Amino acid sequence: NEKVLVLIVGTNPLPNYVVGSHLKEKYDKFVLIYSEKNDKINQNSTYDYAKKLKEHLNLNDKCIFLPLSDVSNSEKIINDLREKFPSEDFVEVHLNYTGGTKTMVVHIYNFLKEKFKNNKIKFEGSYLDARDYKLVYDYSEEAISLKDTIKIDINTLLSIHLYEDIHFEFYDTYSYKQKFVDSFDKISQEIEKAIKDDKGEDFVKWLEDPFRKIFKGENKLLEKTAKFKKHIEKLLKDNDSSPIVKFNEKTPQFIWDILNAFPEGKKLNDGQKLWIPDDKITNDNLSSRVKDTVEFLNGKWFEWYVYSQIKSELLDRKLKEGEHFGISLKAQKKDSPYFELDIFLINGYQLIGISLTTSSTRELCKLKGFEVIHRVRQIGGDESKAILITGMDKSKTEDLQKDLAYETGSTQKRFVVFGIDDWADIGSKICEEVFK
Amino acid sequence: NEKVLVLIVGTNPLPNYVVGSHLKEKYDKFVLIYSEKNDKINQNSTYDYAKKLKEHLNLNDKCIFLPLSDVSNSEKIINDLREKFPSEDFVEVHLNYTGGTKTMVVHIYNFLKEKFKNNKIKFEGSYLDARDYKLVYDYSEEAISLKDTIKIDINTLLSIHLYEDIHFEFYDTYSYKQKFVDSFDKISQEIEKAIKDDKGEDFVKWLEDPFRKIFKGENKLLEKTAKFKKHIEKLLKDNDSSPIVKFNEKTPQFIWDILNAFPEGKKLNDGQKLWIPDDKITNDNLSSRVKDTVEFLNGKWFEWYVYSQIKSELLDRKLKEGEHFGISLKAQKKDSPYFELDIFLINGYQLIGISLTTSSTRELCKLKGFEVIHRVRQIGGDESKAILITGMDKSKTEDLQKDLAYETGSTQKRFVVFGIDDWADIGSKICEEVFK
């Protein structure tokens, strides 16, 4: 009296994983239908998805792989099913037709339904709704919500999507925490006080002028004293208009406080003025003092600020750091480009990918919008949500969101843009969009 | 004794239009199944697509509209089909299930296949393959190629996607032919010789410096004499380092030829020197002189260059100007942002959009690649094809193509990128990629 669940393994592996996890204990056999490789008809193989599905569902011998040789031909689909589908006399047959192409599902459904139509065998069809997180049974008016029922971690999620070599950091392994061992908290807290005091616009403006004019230029500018001295002497040619004078005389007190939270040996300032090295300073001395500090103030601080805000607002939500959220996600897949996500969040089985920038130039921001939209789609299916955080004003943020929404067919439940008016409250604004 | 063709009207109207065009004369009745508006379940209507499909196929009284109240629930689909579908005793029912969602098509197919299996009416099922342009019949081993059989023009293609306010240009109505009256031919030819002499890179590098540093700044820089004079005087202070000096003293000979092709009252030069207007020159004199010239030289020329190379290679082909190719396509959809394609080509029913830039900056090229890939899928379905033309070198060009094809799931024949080395014979390369 065995009961069989049938899944169709296409290219989006997450729904089948959620449906298999929910129903694993109620079925004796699992039939995993997948597309074989066939270079003549240009049919790509989904066998590796099928293997990763069996592996992470822990199905073992209960799993029967059913290869289809030509998923574009109706007759070859039926002949392959008739030859290979398990012949046991089942008391229930459950086809979940969420995965696979339209053509496959149509004839996989019709074949199985008719096969048991006259054996008084309970037949069931279902699909997983990606907009509601519900398992919609075919002839039932009610659908069960799986959002708070199925939980998945970042390692498993990337595994079923065939990614290996997974690396991410969290609160304790964050890289710049190691570059400022005894200072990072003091530095993070000054910046956080500033942003939470609505100083984001003022910081970003100062960061462009005079900060970047002083500290960004040619390659290895901050690693060679001679380069940096020639850079500084040429800036002194602007006289009263020079970024040096701006730094010394027009830096707001909150930025002075941020500068002075760094250790003395890693400060861009020498007292209440710019530190300008002399000729005796070796390249090691210039690098040790300025390089890491400049890298952080040039934009890495915003990645930590937003992540620390999220982690705070998740303190009462039972998401585990290093499993359901993290920062700096890197992964790779065979014959595939390098995968990168600034911050990731998993809410149930909803992947939340966040891409961050302090910029307000539209071309840059729109590029990062396309990127994060496609990235989260690659490891989270249709259930996923992409969030882009920029330094644009309220109007420009809404236009970019509207433009990207209609251009990629993304609803707001699937793609949100935030701006500089949201930085002080980015923790609660992100969590509101996710846990709605 | 009639034969009825059944179509499913989702949001991708092109395949239904192609299949209907191919099968219209061989069928006597037509059932267009669509999603009706249902606000309780947030189900939008696809009737506007169905109505346009009936219009541009000229079905009239032979067309039967079949609304579906809940395309997400199998019971509702079956009951709406059992009630609304024609009850007449047909000799052949042909369901083409290319349109619609996967869940609808499952239950529409099984319902109809089992209705006419019991009644012993010939039932035919087919789908349209976007990869190979073939109508695949369910239990026939042969697919009919429609690649060289079905045709569509750009008005009908946009009209079935619900686009109105359609505007585009062709060889005779190109806008800049009027702004530089009686001289545009000389300007094009002068620019064409430069590119075909492989001076495109030198040209682009002179546009960045000094051209753009002189003519791009304030929003109305070229429309108010005081703004442009202020701007020139600020740069002129850069003795031995001014863009004005570089313009006057380091401009290659071939660019002087380009600048001197413009009419007298449209020239940026005053002899061998930059034209610096004095205070008595009016805003309308400055704007009349440089504004159109600057927009054309700043990048519009490249759109015309490529377009004219394509038109030269498309002579005596099935493509016709204003029907199957044009330049500067603008269309507007209700409650939607404006649609824009630099160049469009329709080969059969394959929409080929082209986005152009002379930039070699990867960030800007990657953005334009994203945009054109999504745009052709908006008005061209999975049959469409996107081409990006950059000023990048050979290796970065092929890297960007590989990178963007993966992120967007595009075949190497459905997203093509060209670079600076391709400029001279761009028309030959484009027509090779198009007709292959």
DSSP string, A359-376: ---HHHHHHHHHHHHHHH
- Which residues of chain B does A107 touch, with a Cβ-Cβ cutoff of 8 Å? 138
Using the beta-carbon criterion (under 8 Å), do B106 and A105 form an inter-chain contact?
Answer: yes
Closest CA to A314 of A343, A342, A341, A345: A345
Using the beta-carbon criterion (under 8 Å), do A370 and B375 form an inter-chain contact?
Answer: no
Tell me which method was used to determine the 3D structure.
X-ray
Q: Is B329 exposed, middle or buried (0-12, 13-18, 19+ CB in 10 A)?
A: buried
What count of Cα atoms within 13 Å lies in the side-chain half-sphere of residue A119? 15
The response to whether B335 counts as a known ligand-binding position is no
Q: Which residue has the tokens 């002080």?
A: A424
What count of other Cβ atoms lies within 10 Å of the Cβ of residue B178? 10
The structure tokens listed for B219 are 């929003």
Residue to mutate among B370, B375, B411, with most A CBs inside 10 A, is B370
Rounded distance, CA B251 to CA B265, Å?
Answer: 21
At A235, which helix (H) or strand (E)?
Answer: helix A225-235
Q: Is A436 exposed, middle or buried (0-12, 13-18, 19+ CB in 10 A)?
A: exposed
Distance from B123 to chain A by nearest Cα, in Å?
A: 14
Rounded distance, CA A23 to CA A270, Å?
Answer: 65
A321: DSSP letter: B
Using the beta-carbon criterion (under 8 Å), do A109 and B105 form an inter-chain contact?
Answer: no
The response to whether B88 counts as a known ligand-binding position is no
Using the beta-carbon criterion (under 8 Å), do A337 and B127 form an inter-chain contact?
Answer: no
- Which residues of chain A does B118 touch, with a Cβ-Cβ cutoff of 8 Å? none
Distance from B8 to chain A by nearest Cα, in Å?
A: 13
Distance from B272 to chain A by nearest Cα, in Å?
A: 31
Rounded distance, CA B338 to CA A276, Å?
Answer: 52
Could you tell me which residues of chain B have a Cβ less than 8 Å from any Cβ in chain A? 72-75, 97, 102-103, 105-107, 109-110, 113-114, 125, 127, 129, 131, 136, 138-139, 141, 336-337, 363-364, 366-367, 370-371, 374-375, 378, 402-403, 406-408
3-state secondary structure of A149: coil
Using the beta-carbon criterion (under 8 Å), do A407 and B375 form an inter-chain contact?
Answer: yes
A275: DSSP letter: -
Task: Give me the helices (H) in A296-341, please.
Answer: 301-313
The structure tokens listed for B14 are 């092109």
For A110, which of B113, B336, B402 is closest by C-beta distance? B113
- Which residues of chain B does A162 touch, with a Cβ-Cβ cutoff of 8 Å? none
| Domains, chain B, with CATH or none | 3-150 (3.40.50.10770), 182-305 (no CATH), 321-434 (3.40.1350.10)
Q: What's the longest Cα–Cα distance across chain B?
A: 92
Using the beta-carbon criterion (under 8 Å), do B102 and A105 form an inter-chain contact?
Answer: yes
CA B192-B196-B201 angle, 5° bins = 95
Angle between helices B102-118 and A102-115 (to 10 degrees): 50
Residues 6+ apart with CB under 8 A from B132: B143, B145, B147
Rounded distance, CA B186 to CA B179, Å?
Answer: 13
Using the beta-carbon criterion (under 8 Å), do A73 and B105 form an inter-chain contact?
Answer: no
Cα B228 to chain center, whole Å? 36
How would DSSP label each residue in A91-130? SEEEEE-SSS-HHHHHHHHHHHHHHTTTTT-EEEEEEEET
Rounded distance, CA B259 to CA B319, Å?
Answer: 34
The response to whether A321 counts as a known ligand-binding position is no
Closest CA to A156 of A385, A380, A355, A384: A380
Rounded distance, CA A372 to CA A22, Å?
Answer: 29
3-state secondary structure chain B: CCEEEEEEECCCHHHHHHHHHHHCCCCCEEEEEEECCEHHHCECCCHHHHHHHHHHHCCHHHEEEEEECCCCCHHHHHHHHHHHCCCCCCCEEEEECCCCCHHHHHHHHHHHHHHHHHCCCEEEEEEEECCCCEEEECCCCCEEECCCCCCCCHHHHHHCCCEEEEEEECCCCCCHHHHCCCCHHHHHHHHHHHHHCCCHHHHHHHHHHHHHHHHCCCCCHHHCHHHHHHHHHHHHCCCCCCHHHHHHHCCCHHHHHHHHHCCHHHCCECCCCECCCCCCCCHHHHHHHHHHHHHHHHHHHHHHHHHHHHHHHCCCCCCCECCCEEEEEEEEECCCCEEEEEEEEEECCEEEEEEECCCCCHHHHHHHHHHHHHHHHHHHHHHCEEEEECCCCHHHHHHHHHHHHHHHCCCCCCEEEECHHHCCCHHHHHHHHHCC
Instruction: Please say whether the beta carbons of A273 and A279 come within 8 A.
Output: no
3-state secondary structure of A165: strand
For A370, which of B102, B370, B378 is closest by C-beta distance? B370
Rounded distance, CA B145 to CA B135, Å?
Answer: 6
For A367, which of B336, B367, B375 is closest by C-beta distance? B367
The structure tokens listed for B415 are 């997203």
CA distances from B15 to A422, B11, B151, B161, B377 (A): 44, 10, 12, 12, 13
Using the beta-carbon criterion (under 8 Å), do B106 and A129 form an inter-chain contact?
Answer: no
Find the residue in A nearest to B131 (Cα): A42
Resolution limit in angstroms?
Answer: 2.5
